[PDB]
Design a protein around this ligand. Sequence first.
Ligand SMILES: CC(C)C[C@@H](C=O)NC(=O)[C@H](CC(C)C)NC(=O)[C@H](CC(C)C)NC(=O)OCc1ccccc1
Ligand SMILES: CC(C)C[C@@H](C=O)NC(=O)[C@H](CC(C)C)NC(=O)[C@H](CC(C)C)NC(=O)OCc1ccccc1
Ligand SMILES: CC(C)C[C@@H](C=O)NC(=O)[C@H](CC(C)C)NC(=O)[C@H](CC(C)C)NC(=O)OCc1ccccc1
Ligand SMILES: CC(C)C[C@@H](C=O)NC(=O)[C@H](CC(C)C)NC(=O)[C@H](CC(C)C)NC(=O)OCc1ccccc1
Lengths: 212, 212, 220, 202, 202, 204, 196, 196, 200
Amino acid sequence: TQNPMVTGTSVLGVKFEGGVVIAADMLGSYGSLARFRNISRIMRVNNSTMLGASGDYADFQYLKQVLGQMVIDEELLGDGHSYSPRAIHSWLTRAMYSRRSKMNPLWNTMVIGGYADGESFLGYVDMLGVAYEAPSLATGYGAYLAQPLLREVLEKQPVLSQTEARDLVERCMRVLYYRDARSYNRFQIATVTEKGVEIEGPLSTETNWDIA
Amino acid sequence: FSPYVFNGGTILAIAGEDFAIVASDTRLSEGFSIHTRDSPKCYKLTDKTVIGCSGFHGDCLTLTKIIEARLKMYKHSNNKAMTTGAIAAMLSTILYSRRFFPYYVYNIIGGLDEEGKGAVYSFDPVGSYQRDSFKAGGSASAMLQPLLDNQVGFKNMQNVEHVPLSLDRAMRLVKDVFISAAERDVYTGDALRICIVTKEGIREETVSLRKD
Amino acid sequence: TTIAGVVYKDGIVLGADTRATEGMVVADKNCSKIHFISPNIYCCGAGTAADTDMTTQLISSNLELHSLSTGRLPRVVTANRMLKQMLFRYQGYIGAALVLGGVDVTGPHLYSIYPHGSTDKLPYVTMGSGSLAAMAVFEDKFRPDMEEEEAKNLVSEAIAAGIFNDLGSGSNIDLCVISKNKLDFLRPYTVPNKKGTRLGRYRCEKGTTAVLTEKITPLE
Amino acid sequence: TTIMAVQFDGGVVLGADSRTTTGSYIANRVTDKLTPIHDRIFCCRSGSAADTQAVADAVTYQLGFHSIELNEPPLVHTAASLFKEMCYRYREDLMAGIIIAGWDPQEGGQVYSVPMGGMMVRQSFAIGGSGSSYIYGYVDATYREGMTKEECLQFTANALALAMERDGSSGGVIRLAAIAESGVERQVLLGDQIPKFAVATL
Amino acid sequence: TTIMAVQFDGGVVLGADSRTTTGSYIANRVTDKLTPIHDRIFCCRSGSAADTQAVADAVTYQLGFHSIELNEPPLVHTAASLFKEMCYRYREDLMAGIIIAGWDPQEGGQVYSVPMGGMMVRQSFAIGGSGSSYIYGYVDATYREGMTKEECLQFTANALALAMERDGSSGGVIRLAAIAESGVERQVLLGDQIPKFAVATL
Amino acid sequence: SIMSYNGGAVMAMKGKNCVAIAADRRFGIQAQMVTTDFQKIFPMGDRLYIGLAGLATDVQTVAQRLKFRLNLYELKEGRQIKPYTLMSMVANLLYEKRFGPYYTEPVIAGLDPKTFKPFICSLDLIGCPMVTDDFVVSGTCAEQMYGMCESLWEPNMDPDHLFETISQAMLNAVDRDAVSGMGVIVHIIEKDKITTRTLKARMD
Amino acid sequence: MEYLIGIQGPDYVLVASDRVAASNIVQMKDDHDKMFKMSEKILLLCVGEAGDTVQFAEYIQKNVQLYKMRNGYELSPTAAANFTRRNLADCLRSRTPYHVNLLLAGYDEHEGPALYYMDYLAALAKAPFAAHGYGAFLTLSILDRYYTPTISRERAVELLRKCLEELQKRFILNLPTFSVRIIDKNGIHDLDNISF
Amino acid sequence: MEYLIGIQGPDYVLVASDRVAASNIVQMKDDHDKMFKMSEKILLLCVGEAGDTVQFAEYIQKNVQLYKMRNGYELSPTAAANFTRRNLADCLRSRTPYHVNLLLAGYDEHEGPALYYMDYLAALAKAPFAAHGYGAFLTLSILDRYYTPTISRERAVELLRKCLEELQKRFILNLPTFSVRIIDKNGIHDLDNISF
Amino acid sequence: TTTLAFKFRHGVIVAADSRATAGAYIASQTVKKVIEINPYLLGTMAGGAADCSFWERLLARQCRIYELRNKERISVAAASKLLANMVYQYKGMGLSMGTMICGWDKRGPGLYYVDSEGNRISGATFSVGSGSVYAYGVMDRGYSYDLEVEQAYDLARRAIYQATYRDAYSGGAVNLYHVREDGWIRVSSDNVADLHEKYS
Ligand SMILES: CC(C)C[C@@H](C=O)NC(=O)[C@H](CC(C)C)NC(=O)[C@H](CC(C)C)NC(=O)OCc1ccccc1
Ligand SMILES: CC(C)C[C@@H](C=O)NC(=O)[C@H](CC(C)C)NC(=O)[C@H](CC(C)C)NC(=O)OCc1ccccc1
Ligand SMILES: CC(C)C[C@@H](C=O)NC(=O)[C@H](CC(C)C)NC(=O)[C@H](CC(C)C)NC(=O)OCc1ccccc1
Ligand SMILES: CC(C)C[C@@H](C=O)NC(=O)[C@H](CC(C)C)NC(=O)[C@H](CC(C)C)NC(=O)OCc1ccccc1
């Protein structure tokens, strides 16, 4: 995509004791216009991997289709091997880099979260194939607004419980709504644990003080 | 759409009589933000060879994977692991293979030669390389090189005995140069990773730097 | 650069880092970014260093002239109006982003002046490259009518977030507390980061350098 | 940015959002975009914050001196004319769209629009800003002649709420102000006070 | 351009203006922007005339062949998918925003939006085109769940009438189509039949 | 860059009651060397020196205009200027041309005329003062100079050790710069003597 | 491009310059003079953009002669060189810059011979020898190889010849003739032109 | 720019070319040969972009020699000129055009002497005399003034010297020596270089 | 960079500096700018370090293949044409390379200059690089075909030294090569600092 058309805003992610949490607002902006306000920007890749994406939504849907089909193909064999979150992270890095080399990039910034073999995974992939794994991630304006809060807490306390991570994510999403001009009140929270992947319905940051 | 982005990073290699040292900072950045603080830039290739890559992380990941694949291909077809000199020659061809879309990567190889003595090879983004005794590359190369030449090369110093460089002295030099670089270069900091190559094996050490 | 300000219960608390960068290399490790405007008004500066210094110095001199003529303490509104009218006249070519705060007869006031000559009067503001990092802390923890100690801790944390998450900010944290009956200018309020201890010795022994010509010119 | 002004028998109602942005960053989320030029005369500002503030300050200075000299309250038309004169002359340098609304004894409640370029026109109701494009149909469909002050306040609140919902450069809280002979009554709608329209879910 | 589609229990309602421009000149003032993709599937075309006609013909050929192979009526979702695949693959070369609405036995009346770039999403109601930006507030305010076919027709006619009034690239006559299990009922509103909203008087 | 047209490098350092200011000698147009004796450190007093780097024409213009102002100031006030006031005069002079600036980055080194307190500073091309207690650098090889100074400088250095440190920092820094070098001139300013030395440097 | 060269000896200054005035691949003049007589002991060699060279050099000449007529003594070579730099630098940022490269040669009774180098940016340097133009690239190394501080004027002319022969053998432009002049305590002496 | 010239007489063709190979400002070679021997009675003179001249000239030389080896008789000058024009024109619109200006001189047993002019656009023309390079602007008028169809080869060399002397006097580039060759019914004869 | 070579009675002398710069930063001062194609042939580098190194190595590969196939060593003229044809394919694509092919073929000493711009000319003396103009002046004034071996060495060293003195992007050490009928030899490698003391 030379020029993105409908895009999603920041996507957050923080790993806790026995899982990972990812959040993303349900809003596709057509360049400073809240056009589509009820679109999910989080995907359940498989039983132990989820994915949230910023940037062009059309490119995200294409990756959703390609990644979904590949997971189906692997499950058909029934050989007892499943793509780990790290493997999906590796594949996405190669896919994004290959498109960049061809000068036809996939205008997306993806956050991968998973839990396999008793170990949380949280990965980052950019439009140009830049990839790394960190305890917390935030794309778009979240790298400026939300990332400072997550890093500050994690440095003080490396290990978080699920409740602490959920509260931290909620606070960060509130900050993004206050300051980011391409954000929306409604958002989703996806959690991956030993019991699989769960996506919470459309939440809200109604706890928004407006003391002017 | 620009297919390149500078992610920072500083690398350093010192060759000794019976050892080789490769060190790098563990910060990854983009623009004015910090992607992560725990991404070492030193990659172990064989039991006696290490490579340090810095620049565009998208190219750094792809190049390291290609080198890892090529090392395995050589071993299969030749029934012997590649030497440091062979790796440097191969990397030069790989880098020049993209002379019209080059890898935005600065590489420095370090390891033992066939005789058991430390060897260091420094590369340009397009392939040109030389067998040096010590080199620095990346964001703070201009800061690191002058002191290494003075202290390791004994340049501009008269009536000074040219005692062989010791492992302990080399380790102290590596720590000092990176500490000074952290105080002045914005792109280098977080932590310092040091890989020591000897006949026994590859040893690793980490020391904290400033967090900006 | 991260400069912040908060209006707490009694007065103003201004914060700032102490880093100045030329290109991508740290030039000054102890730059002072909180500028004296009057005995009761102070201004934090972000942007072009020369512009902020010249602008704050000029306004401070003008206010001192104004204060002498009137015989009364200057008002924050007067400082804000003079700053914006000057910056607007130059159409944003003065790269001066300012956080103006002070206490006067009408009470504490905090402004945020932008290079183009637009101002916002708000309970808390931030500027610089680390502005977003600081504003995250403010949006997360700010409360109206805070105690002086709580306000200082909040501004210190806001500046620290910018310091540790922005490449354009670093070094120490400076604070300036203004109230109706006090002014605490804590220059090195905190020192989060320090240079490591040198492990080796590289002292140059006398005679290590080679000299071509020498000339001694006694004075006095 | 969304600025709206309506005229009713004996006064006018002004409203605006409270968002100021620098790209995609909300520098100020509680900005007050209703600047009192005089008593019973207001202006809603849109466009560049620096230009509108400078222009509003200059007109405030000019109108105040003019009123003192004449020893009579200023006319809303005069205040609009001063805005028109400066906005037209510096049209190449200013990026400012204004709507001037207020009350004067001679003509009662008036609403004038001074868009970018410096033209002036009297309107029964006016809208402006980035977010005004999303409520052109709504105001045209739901506007009526002879609305009361309370109806105008609700009409303005509904229109602004819709624009803030859609436009990305609009948001925060809704600031209203009703101007009549009695005085100026300002209020702020925030949180649940803002009119709400259910989002369709399939 | 202004294209709108609404979904009710039993079917869908489509609507569009009838203006095609080449700058400020109206090349065709009675153009039909509702293209029957199949017996009970329609598409509303916005953007480039050539691109939309070419893509509509291509999908019609693909969907018809697909329906013949599988002796069953096509799915509205399948029609949208074919549009998405074409629009996404050739997003660099195409300038076309499509609304796909129709009825099929499995899912009933459905509306799918395929804007520029190849995105696809199902909506209770969809709008698009140059003039759609002027009625975002109106539709968000006046839309209610569980409307009837008659109410949806009135809703679509009112929305288009407002957009055509405020948009220079939209005008002419309103073309409406209601699709249900019974069939397709096409309608044209012209002259006084178009909804009218009075203008102000200052 | 315009600042790299003529190259150049100037550094200043602090010791115990002494200051050292050093510079290279090369003067060239782009890649061509013209002379190897160009003056870049100008005396502004008995124990006050200004070192300018950057465009050669601007280096000479600023040094002459600064002397013009300094001579008038001293005659009018009947006193020797203090290092701090010289900085302010230089910063004011540079900022008068904030639009169309002089392409030079001065560094000031000297002792207070009364207390003999060491003082060093540096300015941007538009006059942004910067006082430091360790050292200041300015020129084409700033990055190289920083690396040497940060690792060699120590506090409370005798004049002999101060000279060795600055000379080594300057020599090794310019050795990694193409458009700087061809000799180094070092001034060590003490309370009672000004010793000037020329270092044996590479001429390639 | 034009060519200038200057060699300074113990008690003299030797200067030379080509005598070609070209205009778009044609030699309009074969005996052009690029040396200006500032005074009885100073010479200004000016090359650069057309019009700028003559306008600047003549303007400086008028002022230097005026100084002599007003004060009764001539300007020193150093003062004249610094006066020229001041005027060039002042006009550098104006709306009418002068694009001229200058060599100033002179002899003072007290200071002795002096050769000065100045480019269009008005950077003034004092050198034992200097050269301007593209030919300077080929001849400067020759001067570095063979020049000595105590070079006799006979040897200096020989060294000048070696520089000019190099231009004929290796330079691409046609520069057949060169004006030659020498300044010493007796004033300006015009030597025989070096021709090929 | 390199210089080529050709004069056609009643029973001969006289061609000359300069012998300079300059990189940027330094003559890297002073005895360069710009004449290619197509056959025993055809010469090709090539000047243009570096690399293009040699690659195009050598390619044509190989093909003409191949034609001779295949058929047992050499190509006529007219056939060789049109063959060269075809290859240049064909490559003109391709991705690798040749920027070369050519002069083809040859003698035919039946038709007689022939001189052909061809610019880099592959426009072929037959003229009694022609010149290439910036010198052409300066020597062509001389040829027009003094050339007659019945010019003897002795007067042709004198006329050639006139043109070369004009280049020395009025041209800006340094072209000291020239290569001279003459084609007649006996083949190609190498005359003495005209040097200055 | 500065590289020079000239043919005289007893062979052809080849010399170069050892400096490589990345912009205004001196990346290295020990770069070998003379490539040993074979015991009777060597080539110099000037311009892009990567371009020169890769294409000279490719030429050395081609020369060895030629020797194996034809059971006879390649000639200097053939080697220069081989390199010129190889690089002409990429004309206009940004290659920056200038080289000199020096050797002793069956036709005596040979010296060719090959540039990425497509130039290929034989000659008696050549100089390539940024300091080429400076080296030309000293070499031209001191060159004679009848020079003695020791005199030729000094002329090459002095010409390179003067170029490094005047050229910012040239310096390091002067590597000197001599090509004779029985192959080339490495005669010396003198640092410019040491030379400056000797000449001054
Ligand atoms: C010193 C504070 C005001 C804040 C500080 C931010 O880190 N400001 C800065 O760093 C600003 C630029 C900024 C956009 C990064 N610039 C600076 O600090 C430096 C001076 C240092 C050596 C002390 N300024 C500088 O190099 O000026 C370049 C320039 C030249 C012409 C016009 C405008 C700016
Ligand atoms: C204050 C309102 C009447 C105007 C306001 C409303 O949309 N305007 C804006 O927000 C416009 C938006 C657009 C020009 C990028 N922004 C602006 O005018 C400027 C950006 C300049 C570079 C032009 N934004 C900015 O930094 O605002 C600072 C500010 C913050 C609070 C109050 C007043 C001013
Ligand atoms: C859905 C259809 C009705 C298409 C319609 C949408 O409303 N499109 C349009 O009205 C657009 C508007 C434009 C501003 C992009 N116009 C167009 O697509 C026009 C229509 C032709 C009949 C001239 N096409 C166009 O400009 O290219 C055709 C053309 C080619 C050469 C010369 C002049 C015109
Ligand atoms: C054989 C070469 C070293 C000759 C040398 C001089 O021209 N090359 C250079 O100076 C080149 C090109 C420059 C002229 C623009 N400079 C360079 O900086 C190039 C890489 C850049 C073009 C990205 N080479 C470089 O940095 O050196 C890498 C190197 C390091 C050690 C040995 C060999 C090569």
